[PDB]
């Protein structure tokens, strides 16, 4: 969840 792990 919350995108790819780049930002979150």
Residue numbers in the entry: 1 to 8
Article sentences:
Novo29 is an eight-residue depsipeptide comprising a macrolactone ring and a linear tail. Novo29 kills bacteria by inhibiting bacterial cell-wall synthesis, with no detectable resistance occurring upon serial passaging.
The crystallographic phases were determined using single-wavelength anomalous diffraction (SAD) phasing from the incorporated iodide ions. Novo29 did not form crystals from any of the conditions tested. epi-Novo29 formed rod-shaped crystals from 2.8 M sodium acetate at pH 7.0. Further optimization in a 24-well plate format afforded long rectangular crystals suitable for X-ray diffraction from 2.8 M sodium acetate at pH 6.6. The asymmetric unit contains two molecules of epi-Novo29, which exhibit only minor differences in conformation. In the X-ray crystallographic structure, epi-Novo29 adopts an amphiphilic conformation, with the side chains of Phe1, d-Leu2, Leu7, and Leu8 creating a hydrophobic surface and the side chains of d-Lys3, Ser4, and (2R,3S)-hydroxyAsn5, as well as the N-terminal ammonium group, creating a hydrophilic surface. The macrolactone ring of epi-Novo29 adopts a conformation in which the main-chain NH groups of (2R,3S)-hydroxyAsn5, Ala6, Leu7, and Leu8 converge to create a cavity, which binds ordered water and acetate anion. In contrast, epi-Novo29 exhibited no MIC activity (>32 μg/mL) against any of the bacteria, thus indicating that the 2R,3R stereochemistry of the hydroxyAsn residue is critical to the antibiotic activity of Novo29.
